[PDB]
Amino acid sequence: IRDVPADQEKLFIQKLRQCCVLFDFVSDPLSDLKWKEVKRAALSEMVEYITHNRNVITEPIYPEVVHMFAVNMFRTLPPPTLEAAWPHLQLVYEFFLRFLESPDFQPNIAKKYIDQKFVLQLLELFDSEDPRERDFLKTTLHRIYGKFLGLRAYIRKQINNIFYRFIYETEHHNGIAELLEILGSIINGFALPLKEEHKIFLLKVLLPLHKVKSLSVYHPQLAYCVVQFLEKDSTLTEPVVMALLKYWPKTHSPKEVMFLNELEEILDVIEPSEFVKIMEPLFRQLAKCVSSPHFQVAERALYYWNNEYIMSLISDNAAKILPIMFP
Amino acid sequence: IRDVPADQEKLFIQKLRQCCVLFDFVSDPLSDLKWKEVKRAALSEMVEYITHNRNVITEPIYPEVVHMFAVNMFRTLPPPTLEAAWPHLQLVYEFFLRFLESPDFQPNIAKKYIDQKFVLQLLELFDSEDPRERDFLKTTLHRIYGKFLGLRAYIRKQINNIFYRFIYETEHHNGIAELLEILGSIINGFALPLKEEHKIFLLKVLLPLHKVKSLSVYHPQLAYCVVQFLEKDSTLTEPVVMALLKYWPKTHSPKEVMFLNELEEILDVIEPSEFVKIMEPLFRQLAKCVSSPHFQVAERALYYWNNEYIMSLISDNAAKILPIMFP
Amino acid sequence: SPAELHSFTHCGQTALTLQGATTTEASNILRSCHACRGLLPNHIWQGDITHFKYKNTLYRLHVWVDTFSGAISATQKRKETSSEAISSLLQAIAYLGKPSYINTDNGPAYISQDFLNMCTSLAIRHTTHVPYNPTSSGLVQRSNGILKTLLYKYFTDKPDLPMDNALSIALWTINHLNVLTNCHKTRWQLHHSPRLQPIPETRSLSNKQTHWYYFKLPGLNSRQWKGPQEALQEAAGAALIPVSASSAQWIPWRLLKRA
Amino acid sequence: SPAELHSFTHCGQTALTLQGATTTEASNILRSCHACRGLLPNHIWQGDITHFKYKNTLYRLHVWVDTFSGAISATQKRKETSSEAISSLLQAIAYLGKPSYINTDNGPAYISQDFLNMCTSLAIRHTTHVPYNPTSSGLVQRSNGILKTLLYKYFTDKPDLPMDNALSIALWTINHLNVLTNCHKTRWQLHHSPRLQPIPETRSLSNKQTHWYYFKLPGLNSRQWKGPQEALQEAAGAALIPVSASSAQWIPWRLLKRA
Amino acid sequence: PSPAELHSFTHCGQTALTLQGATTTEASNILRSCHACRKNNPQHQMPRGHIRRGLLPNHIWQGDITHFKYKNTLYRLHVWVDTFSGAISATQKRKETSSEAISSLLQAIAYLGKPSYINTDNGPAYISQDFLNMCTSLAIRHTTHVPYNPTSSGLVQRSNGILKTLLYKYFTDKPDLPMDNALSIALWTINHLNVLTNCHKTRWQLHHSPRLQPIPETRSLSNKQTHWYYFKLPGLNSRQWKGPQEALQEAAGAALIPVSASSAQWIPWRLLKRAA
Amino acid sequence: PSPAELHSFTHCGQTALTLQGATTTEASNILRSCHACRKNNPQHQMPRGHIRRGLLPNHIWQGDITHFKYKNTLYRLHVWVDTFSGAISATQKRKETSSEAISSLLQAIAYLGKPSYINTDNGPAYISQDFLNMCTSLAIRHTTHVPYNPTSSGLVQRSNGILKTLLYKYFTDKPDLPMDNALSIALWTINHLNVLTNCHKTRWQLHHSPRLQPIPETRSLSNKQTHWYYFKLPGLNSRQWKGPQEALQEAAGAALIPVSASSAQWIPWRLLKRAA
DNA sequence: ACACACTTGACTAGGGTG
DNA sequence: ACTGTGTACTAAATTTCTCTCCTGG
DNA sequence: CCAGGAGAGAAATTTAGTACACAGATATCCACCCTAGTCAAGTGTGT
DNA sequence: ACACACTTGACTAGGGTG
DNA sequence: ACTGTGTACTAAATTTCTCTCCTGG
DNA sequence: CCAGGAGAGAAATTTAGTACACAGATATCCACCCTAGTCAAGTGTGT
Ligand SMILES: [Mg+2]
Ligand SMILES: [Mg+2]
Ligand SMILES: [Zn+2]
Ligand SMILES: [Zn+2]
Ligand SMILES: [Zn+2]
């Protein structure tokens, strides 16, 4: 069964809706596989048809497409794993993404069809362990959040919920990075002076986050977050003073030395105005962590007599650090 | 004295009108020749100024230019001779001709300024003996007659007057050919059926003209007139039959053999419908002029067994000329 | 110039004062160098072949002469077969003009079909003379004798000339710098006076125009055009549109509207 | 093909079923030819020189390996002066990408003023590694050893192949057809993923457009255009204007309106 | 007809015929059956084929080899360019072997990308047997342009000119530096620091992102109807037109004419002239 | 810096500058201070000085000499044209010595008409002292063109093309007829039977009738102000631009200018890359 | 058992396209 | 002191007309 | 019953807009790769 | 009257533009 | 079976703005 | 007393519209005319 011809959107909403039969595909495909391949070919035609023309996307289908979405993948996952039916979910995805950024998508119409419980029935999918879908899900969320406002701040609160529930105990959510990137896209798109809510929820949970362990799996992107955080918001750097320092680890580990590698790659936007009050509490740990039990601190604690301007800072306003720096 | 500057046609009508001093130039130029050359230079500038621009020729000058014309050459001539002051009259002429066919000459305005006694005070100049002016006068008359209607038929009658007064006695007018050409231009520009007036004044004076002698001086052009007369009007050929024949000369002379050369160059538009009634009165002189006193008629009267279609005519309808053509 | 133009050209007495010499100085030019079937309006021709004084070998002057105006066009060659009696005619036709009645004589070079096999292919009535009809000689011979005497006027002085330039120059003088009778017209300007336009009745108007049209590129810029204006001149090349500067120019033009 | 693309390049177990082989067809392919300073995203680099077991002469090859993605670009020379390390870097930088923080040990080819006289010209913070700092060896040497292995897996067969193609092919496989972790991304894919556009606040829109373009010239006629509506593609070349025929084309294009 | 055989005796322009007195349309008919008067004026109104190639996908490449800097060292370079996204890879040193060309292609694959078609000139270093054996060892097609037609490779030919006069710039200045790197530099430029038209992307990044897109398709070429037409031998032997009777097999931009040797040939339309 | 001098290390395009983050127009300033970038990119935006003479009523002949197909023998044709009415006179047989060129002029003058100026190229048969003495003996001027510049004589060079392909037409048909009278034929059908152009007047008429017209006036080549131009030697020696300092006597279209030989030529503007 | 009836070969020559 | 140009060839406008056959004088 | 008349060819007929090539001309060399012929080393017969 | 001082020339040589 | 193209260079539109300084709230 | 506001630069900054040249490469010949020197017939010294 296939077509391209009367050129009636009704016969095409038929082609769309007629996928309303659903396969149970855990281990039993033997019963008439052909409905499966024909479905794949159907959606193939559907996608390049949407690329074909302009007037294809009128109202009578909007809640149907969003329903066909929900019916096609809105279900649980078993809490490095991939999908048997993968190229099928990989096509419902690519079809939806192209559907979203299609030119003729008017938001004022879809506003009632975009739903808050819907998007909650979307974000909980990031907990899965397929990286591939965890990509399509990344990009699609980035398009929604770029294309709506109410749900924009709504999801902001929803994720802060997840944040809380995650950091305070041992959630192996294993799908965090994809939001840390949607975050970075946001924290770039700002203009201060503004509401403190953002920076507040950062000093609330973002930095306390480092109480967490296994940091290798989310360290780079969070570092790129904190730097996208500072620029220009960076004058908001005065209160960052000692935050990680109190959240400093206690035992001997390459965790600590990775966090050193971090701290080494963050002293970049210093400005001497408030830098008066911080060079001392800086050295109150940096010059005072030689007592660490690593065998590396022998050249760890002394990586700052070597920069261009960090050294010139050691010779800029040294009227207060001069006796403390070991002669 | 000269100029080109305020760009006021009043200062240019001044330049024009200030030629209002007139030279008596029979034999006495000694008195301040310089006014003469400066005049020549003046009109030179005037001419190329008229070639220069568009808006130069407004009303306030029209009767002035025609007056300056009349005052400059409307005078008697001594009844192969040329002009001492020639390049001066040759410039008032060329200036006027270019003035006439200038684009911005509106006839509806100059209609009251073009005058019938004026044109009579122009045509009587053709009697002169300078060929050069007899050329400029030719062409200018041809422009007038092309650019007016009332005076058109008027001058037609005026010349028919001249015709009469000329042909009936021994007028040595010596300036005829120039009208015979303006005639030919007219007789081309016709569309019969029409008023017989034209053809009437032709059978009235045009062919009777050949009573005249010395024909060489206007013979070619008149031959070209009579042929422009016939074509296509030529079916109007039926009545031309015997006209010259009765106007045939009487004595022995190269006049007659020139008229033979004519008659030889006129048998070109025969059509057998009315040609029935004429081939006989044709041969009633052609075959019957062997009695001429020339020594040439021995091969003069027999130049017609030799054509392409004249011979085929002798073999087309010979059912009436067969015994008369000498076997 | 007049004494050199004299010896270079060197025709005659009449047409020299129109270059700047006075009456008596023209006669004193004569005193100088001590060596000096109808009328058939345009294109009903006549022609002839002629011998010539062998410098050491006689050449065959082969000429055509109009009968209305009196122009001349001829050439030089050795043989006299219809091959080249043709080539002579054909050249004269590339000169002026294109005839309709060719009467020269009953010569074999005219007898050959090679001749008629060319004439007929040009729609050219061939009317040929009655042989030995010198009643037209005193005139065609007037022309030919002119050619003769002019040639010997050339190379009796400076016999170093080849026999081509002598003919070229002989013509260029005989057909631009002479007036026959009081007509005060050269053979040439007469033979090419643009004929007077015949006048229509009841259409007593005129059409001397081509509609206005835009213009650019006097100088050194590309932009929108200007005007338009009428154009009061024209020629292969430019068209002399009167620029808005109350002045004139010449440009290879842009548009041609209807007028 | 997959058994041949293997013998062509000698990949392993993972990245072959994505060309059409099943699970066991990958393990049996292994049974065929048996037993044969943080993360710093993007561009904060690191590099090194290495010797190499000869064919008969020890080839000295430098290399530059990214630290965020894990790509590699390198070459082989005979001499190892500063002019050499220079030409090596500069080539890798015409390979991808253009860094801003470069690191190395303190060999002589890293000391010379000319080297400095080039680094400074490119706004490139050139730091110094601590010489003999093998805490980064397990990863750099992970790469280097990869190369060493692959090369010997190449020329242990058909040893007559020249000693450069072995390098070219070695790369083309090591940088288009591998993933080590579960990232399911080739090094070279990852290293050039167009970065996600950062969303601006309070203007939740986008700009992806250029409106008509009067189009013509699908085929074989010059005439007025057709009103050319949007372009959903673009490239040096043509732009995919959707023809009113409900069909698509590719043309080098005429107009550019605002959008 | 005095109109017609007049043209058949002088070959004068139609306007002259009109003034002789025959209507324009009959004139226009005459001036398209004076076969000589047709075989001589070179005027060439066939429609241009601007069709260097379609590029639905990426990866239909193009090859060409060039001589640089013959002050003392002829400096032979090979270039391959891609014609979806105008990206250039270029490797010289001197030689011409098949083995050299092969080593160059094999190197360009390490740069981007890994093609699926190819086409170059007629060849010799490309016509080698072992060359095509390397091709087939990589599951790649291969094609050759018509012989003796330089514009055929218009794209590359232009990208060559772009590359030379960038080198020349550098070598006016700094006239000592070795070519190995003054080339590596001129490449990093051509790829990363320029833009083309309102496309307004850097060739490279355009070559990277959009492959996320699908591929339209147009196939099943049809509607073949011959014609007849005299033009010209394509051996640069420019002369009067060369008349053939008629196309054995039509094509799209090209044609196929039996030369009197009863041999197939593929003339491009930029060399033909239609007849009855 | 990185904005400013980057061009001074790569010579990248202005767009690349602004997009790396430089300014908007001082870019444009930078891209006119790289003597290298100017000595290398070729372009002649200098205006198309394109003009003959001819204002006169048909009195500048402009005539050159050329070759012809050999049936079995070359045929030299000299041809002089006019410049206000495109009328052509042409005399050939084999020889291109001075004395024959002279006899050609002396013939093509009988056919209308005696000139007042003349123009040609540097051909030897024209540089002859004897030709010159003949000219002067006839009260004519004479001029040459800058050497090595064929376009200079565009008009006649084209009327040549016109005459050849008319001959070829005839000799396609009737391929026996003698190779001279078919010239007198072509000369007819070029002067009398062929409407020129939009002017719509056969050359012959356009050449006779309008002599009745006067002469407009234009004068005063004046207002000299120099400049500097680095462009290219005009000896077909196409290469990088050839830079001098600067004009000595600018004139209409062309420009006097000294080469380093302290010698002065007149480079046609069409080879000058303006830089002040 | 070695002289000849039988092969390659190497190795020119020549041609064709850029 | 000095400088590109004229014709051929085909699609498209545009302008005649032209019978079809409608209309109320 | 039929003079102006939309009007769909239609036909006809003008106009517009690009391409092409005139220029002094050929021969000769060069880097490469393939096919076709020509003496120069190798092996089975007869008694 | 037979020993040398004075032109062309012829006659080479070479170059420059098409 | 097979087919020209991309950049440089300058005038001209056109679109920011911009103080001048007028106006009646 | 001064915010919108013609408005004349103005400045700035975009766009539009043509030209150019990548192609395998040089040497060698040819028709002609001019300028510069080189012995070779013709004529001037010393008696
Ligand atoms: Mg090539
Ligand atoms: Mg020449
Ligand atoms: Zn293996
Ligand atoms: Zn023809
Ligand atoms: Zn530069």
Distance, first Cα to last Cα, chain A: 86
- Please tell me whether residues D92 and D14 are part of one structural domain: no
Half-sphere exposure of C160 (CA within 13 A, CB side): 2
At C22, list the tokens: 């006075």
Using only C-alpha atoms, what is the Rg of chain C?
A: 25
Residues forming beta bridges with residue F263, ordered by sequence position: F259
Is residue E248 within 8 A of residue E228, CB to CB? The reply is: no
Strand K nucleotides, any atom under 7 Å to a protein CB: 1-13
DSSP letter string, D152-186? HHHHTSSTTS-TTHHHHHHHHHHTTS--SSTT---
Using the structure, give the distance in angstroms from the CA atom of E131 to the C1' atom of G6, rounded to a whole number.
Answer: 37
C72 touches C63 (CB < 8 A): yes
ω into C228 cis (within 30 of 0): yes
Answer yes or no: is E51 within a domain. no
CA F68 to C1' I20, in angstroms, rounded, equals 20
Longest dimension (CA), chain F: 79
Say yes or no: Cβ of E35 under 7 A from any atom of strand L.
no
CA distances in angstroms from F167 to C122, E37, E239, E273, F82, listed in the order given: 19, 11, 14, 21, 21
Domain membership flag for residue F28: no
Residues F245, F140, single domain; the answer is: no
Residue B266's identity, in one-letter code, is I
The answer to whether chain C touches chain D by having 3 or more C-beta pairs less than 8 angstroms apart is no
Q: Count other C-beta atoms under 10 Å from residue B153's C-beta.
A: 12
Q: Is F195 on the interface with C (CB under 8 A)?
A: no
Nearest to A76 by CA among A151, A127, A136: A127
Q: Token pair of B298, please?
A: 């021995």
- Kindly report the nearest CA distance between residue F47 and chain B, in angstroms: 29
Residue F213: CB atoms within 10 Å: 11
Strand order in the sheet with D47-50: D47-50, D60-65, D72-77
Which experiment gave this structure? cryo-EM
C217 within domain boundaries: yes
* CA distance linking residue F17 with residue B291, whole number of Å: 112
Residues F244 and F168 in one domain: no
3-state secondary structure chain F: CCCCCCHHHHCCCHHHHHHHCCCCCHHHHHCCCCHHHHHHCCCCCCCCCCCCCCCCCCCECCEEEECCCCCCCCCEEEEEECCCCCCEEEEEECCCCHHHHHHHHHHHCCCCCCCCECCCCCCHHHHCHHHHHHHHCCCCCCCCCCCCCHHHHHHHHHHHHHHHHHHHHHHHCCCCCCCCHHHHHHHHHHHCCCCCCCCCCCHHHHHHHHHHCCCCCCCCCCCCCCCCECCCCCCCCCCCCCCCCCCCCECCCCEEEEECCCEEEEECHHHCCECC
Pairing of strands D125-126, E61-67: unpaired
Q: Is the CB of F65 under 7 A from strand L?
A: no
Residue entry with tokens 């296509």: B232
CA distance A150 to A107: 12
CB pair distance less than 8 Å for F216 and B47: no
Which residue in D23, D37, D39 has the most chain A C-beta atoms within 10 A of its own C-beta, making it the best mutation to test that interface?
D39
Distance E158 CA to K6 C1' (A): 7
Residues in chain F: 276
B123 neighbors B166 (Cβ within 8 angstroms):
no
| Closest among A155, A60, A152, A58 to A102, alpha carbons compared | A58
At which residue do the structure tokens 């006129």 appear? B266
Asked if D145 and D137 count as a contact pair (C-beta separation under 8 A), the reply is no
Helix (H) or strand (E) holding C227: strand C226-229
Task: Determine whether the distance from the CB of E192 to the nearest atom of strand K is below 7 Å.
Answer: no
As a whole number of angstroms, the distance between CA F166 and CA E12 comes to: 10
Set out the domains of chain B in order of their start, with CATH numbers: 1-327 (1.25.10.10)
> Cβ distance D67 to D44 under 8 Å?
yes
In a domain, F36, yes or no: no
Nearest to E8 by CA among E25, E30, E23, E40: E30
Instruction: Calculate the alpha carbon distances from C115 to C91, C111, C130 in Å.
Output: 14, 7, 18
In DSSP notation, E72-111 reads T---EEEEEEETTT--EEEEEES---HHHHHHHHHHHTTS
Strand pairing partners for D116?
Answer: none
Buried b (16+ CB within 10 A) or exposed e, C189-208: ebbbeeeeebbebeeeeeee
Protein side of the strand J interface (CB < 7 A) = F 121-124, 145, 147-148
Burial of B67 (0-12, 13-18, 19+ CB in 10 A): middle
Backbone φ, ψ for residue F247 (5° rounding)? -60, 145
- The Cα–Cα gap between F140 and F136 comes to 6
What CATH number is attached to the domain comprising D101?
3.30.420.10
Determine, for residues E191 and D94 on separate chains, whether the beta-carbon distance falls below 8 Å. Answer: yes
Residues D58 and D163 grouped into a single domain: yes
Return the nearest residue to H4, CA–C1'. F154
Q: Which residue has the tokens 């620091």?
A: E193
State how beta strands D125-126 and D101-102 pair.
parallel
What is the distance of C-alpha B289 from the center of its chain?
34
Residue tagged 């490779």 (tokens): E153
Instruction: Map tokens 């014309």 to a residue.
Output: B69
Same domain, C127 and C1: no
Rounded to the nearest angstrom, the minimum Cα separation between E251 and chain F is: 32
Distance CA(E246)–CA(A80), nearest Å, equals: 67
* Nucleotides on chain G within 7 angstroms of protein Cβ: 16-18
Let me know: does D81 contact D74? Beta carbons within 8 Å: no
CA distance B325 to F135: 67
Query: Beta strands F255-259 and E76-82: pairing type?
Result: unpaired
CB atoms E172 and F39 under 8 Å: yes
CA A141 to centroid of chain Cα atoms: 9
For residue D85, the number of C-alpha atoms closer than 13 Å in the C-beta half-sphere is: 23
**Tally of domains in chain D:** 3
End-to-end CA distance of chain B: 86
Shared domain check, C118 and C72: yes
By the 8 A CB rule, do E245 and E197 touch?
A: no
Q: Which residue of A has its CA nearest to E217?
A: A48
Closest CA-bearing residue to C1' of K10: F45
d(CA F220, CA F222): 6
Set of chain F residues whose Cβ sits within 8 Å of the Cβ of C86: 181
Torsional class of F120: left (φ above 0), alpha (ψ -120 to 50), beta (otherwise): beta
Q: How far apart are CA E226 and CA E206, in angstroms?
A: 41
Amino acid identity at A43: L
Q: What is the largest CA-CA distance in chain E?
A: 78
**Residue E131 DSSP one-character state:** H
* Residue B315: partners with Cβ closer than 8 Å, 6 or more residues away: none
CB burial of A55-72 (b: ≥16 within 10 Å; e: otherwise) equals ebbeeebbeebbebbeee
* Distance from C-alpha of A34 to C-alpha of A49, rounded to nearest angstrom: 22
Cα-only R_g, chain B: 26
Q: What is the distance between the alpha carbons of residues B321 and C6, in angstroms, rounded to a whole number?
A: 64
Tokens representing residue B77 in the block: 């001539």
- Are the beta carbons of C48 and C104 closer than 8 angstroms? yes
DSSP letter, residue E274: B
Closest-CA residue of chain F to B94: F212
Write the CATH number for E258: 2.30.30
Here the tokens at position A166 are 């995650």
Together in a domain, D210 and D166: no
Instruction: Kindly compute the dihedral angle of the four CA atoms of residues D98, D100, D101, D103, in this order, to the nearest 10 degrees.
Output: 30
Q: Out of D37, D197, D246, whose CB is closest to A261?
A: D37
Q: Do D236 and E205 touch (CB under 8 A)?
A: no
- D24 and D51 assigned to the same domain: no
- 3-state class of C147 per DSSP? helix
**Is the same domain home to F148 and F266?**
no
Q: Which domain holds residue F165?
A: 63-212
Cβ neighbors of D120 (< 8 A, separation 6 or more) are none
CB E254 within 8 A of CB E271: no
- E10 vs C: CB within 8 A: no
Distance of CA A227 to the CA centre of its chain: 15
User: What element of type H or E holds C61?
Assistant: strand C61-65
Distance CA E186, CA E89 (A): 11
Chain breaks in chain A (C to N over 2.5 A) after: 4, 79
Q: Is D38 domain-assigned?
A: no
E-contacting residues of F 208-247, CB under 8 Å?
240
DSSP for D66-116 reads -SSS--EEEEEES--SHHHHHHHHHHHHHSS---SEE-----GGGT-HHHH
Spatial distance from the CA of C157 to the C1' of L37 (Å) = 39
Q: Would you say the C-alpha torsion B176, B179, B185, B190 has a positive or negative sign?
A: negative
CA distance A149 to A146: 8
Q: Is residue D175 domain-shared with residue D58, that is, in the same domain?
A: yes
Through-space separation of residue F130 CA and nucleotide L40 C1' in angstroms: 30
Instruction: Answer yes or no: is E31 within a domain.
Output: yes
- Which three-class secondary structure string do you get for E181-205? HHHHHHHHHHHHCCCCCCCCCCHHH
d(CA E87, CA B205): 96
Is D214 within a domain? yes
Within E 152-191, residues with CB less than 7 Å from strand K: 152, 154-155, 157-158, 162
CA distance E152 to E45: 19
- Determine the nucleotide nearest to F42 by Cα–C1' distance: L20
* F239 within a domain of the structure (yes/no): yes
Contacts of C94 in chain F (CB under 8 A): 184-185, 187-188, 191
Q: Please give the Cα distance from B144 to B99 (Å, whole number).
A: 12
E55 and D236 Cβ atoms separated by less than 8 Å: no
CA angle A282, A286, A289 (to 5 degrees): 140
Contact A141, A123 (CB under 8 A): yes
Cβ neighbours, 10 Å, residue B84: 10
For E260, residues 6+ apart whose C-beta sits below 8 A from its C-beta are none
- Write the single-letter amino acid at A78: P
Q: Encoding tokens for residue E275?
A: 């007849």
Helix (H) or strand (E) holding C75: strand C72-75
Please report which helix (H) or strand (E) contains residue C65, including its range. Answer: strand C61-65
One-letter identity of residue D2: P
Q: Is the CB of residue B96 less than 8 Å from the CB of residue B140?
A: yes
- Final residue before a domain boundary, out of E210, E232, E250: E210
Q: How far is the CA of F150 from the C1' of I24 (A)?
A: 12
Residues preceding gaps in chain D (C to N > 2.5 Å): 36
Distance, C-alpha C118 to centroid of its chain = 24
**Pairs from F27-30 (Cβ < 8 Å, separation ≥ 24):** F30/F4
Compute CA distances C176 → C8, C76, E165, E196, F86, whole Å: 14, 21, 62, 67, 21
Which of chain F's residues 17-56 bind strand K, using a 7 Å CB cutoff?
Answer: 31-32, 37-38, 41, 43, 45
Angle at the Cα of E259 from the Cα atoms of E257 and E263, rounded to 5 degrees: 85
What token pair was written down for B211?
């009573």
Is residue B306 left, alpha or beta, with left meaning phi > 0 and alpha meaning psi from -120 to 50?
A: alpha
Residue F8, both tokens: 């001074």
What single letter denotes the amino acid at residue A258?
M
Report the 10 Å Cβ neighbour count for C61: 20
Which of A135, A127, A136, A124 lies closest to A98 in space, CA to CA? A136
Euclidean distance between CA atoms C133 and C247, whole angstroms: 62
Residue C15 has phi, psi (to 5 degrees) of -85, 20
What does D46-69 look like in DSSP terms, one character per residue? Answer: -EEEE----SSS--EEEEEE-SSS
Neighbours of F236 (CB within 10 A): 7
Of residues C84, C91, C123, C135, the one with CA closest to residue C107 = C84
Helix, strand or coil, per DSSP, at residue C62: strand
Instruction: Dig out the tokens for E67 from the structure.
Output: 């001589």
Q: Are D109 and D142 part of one and the same domain? A: yes
Quick one: which H or E segment has residue D29? helix D24-31
Spatial contact of C2 and C19, defined as CB atoms under 8 Å apart: yes
Q: Do chains D and A touch (3 or more CB pairs under 8 A)?
A: yes
Please answer whether residues F266 and F249 qualify as being in contact, where contact means their C-beta atoms are separated by less than 8 angstroms: no
Nearest-10 crossing angle of helices B177-188, B131-147: 30
Q: Which two tokens stand for residue C80?
A: 């006299």
**Which residues neighbour A171 within 8 Å (Cβ) at sequence distance 6 or greater?**
A165
Smallest CA–CA distance, residue F190 to chain C, in Å, is 9
> In terms of domains, do E197 and E161 share one?
yes
Of chain C, the end-to-end C-alpha distance in Å amounts to: 48
**Interchain contact E/F (3 or more Cβ pairs less than 8 Å):** yes
Query: How far away is chain F from the Cα of B258, in angstroms, using its nearest Cα?
Result: 33
Enumerate residues 6+ apart whose C-beta is below 8 A from C234: C210, C240, F199, F201
Backbone angles phi, psi at E120, to 5 degrees: -140, -175
Residue A174 to residue A170: CA distance in whole angstroms: 11
Count of Cβ atoms closer than 10 Å to residue C224 Cβ: 6
Which chain B residue lies closest to C39 (C-alpha atoms)? B220
Residues forming beta bridges with residue F89, ordered by sequence position: F80
Which of E114, E96, E178 is closest to D77 using CA atoms? Answer: E178
- What is the rounded CA–CA span in Å between residue A52 and residue A45? 10
Give the per-residue SS3 of chain B.
CCCCCCCCHHHHHHHHHCCCCCCCCCCCCCCCCHHHHHHHHHHHHHHHHHHHCCCCCCHHHHHHHHHHHHHHHCCCCCCCCCCCCHHHHHHHHHHHHHHHCCCCCCHHHHCCCCCHHHHHHHHHHHHCCCHHHHHHHHHHHHHHHHHCCHHHHHHHHHHHHHHHHHHCCCCCCCCCHHHHHHHHHHHHCCCCCCCCHHHHHHHHHHCHHHHCCCHHHCHHHHHHHHHHHHCCHHHHHHHHCCHHHHCCCCCCCHHHHHHHHHHHCCCCCCCCCCCCCCHHHHHHHHCCCCCCCCCCHHHHCCCCCCCCHHHHHHCCCCCCCCCCCCC
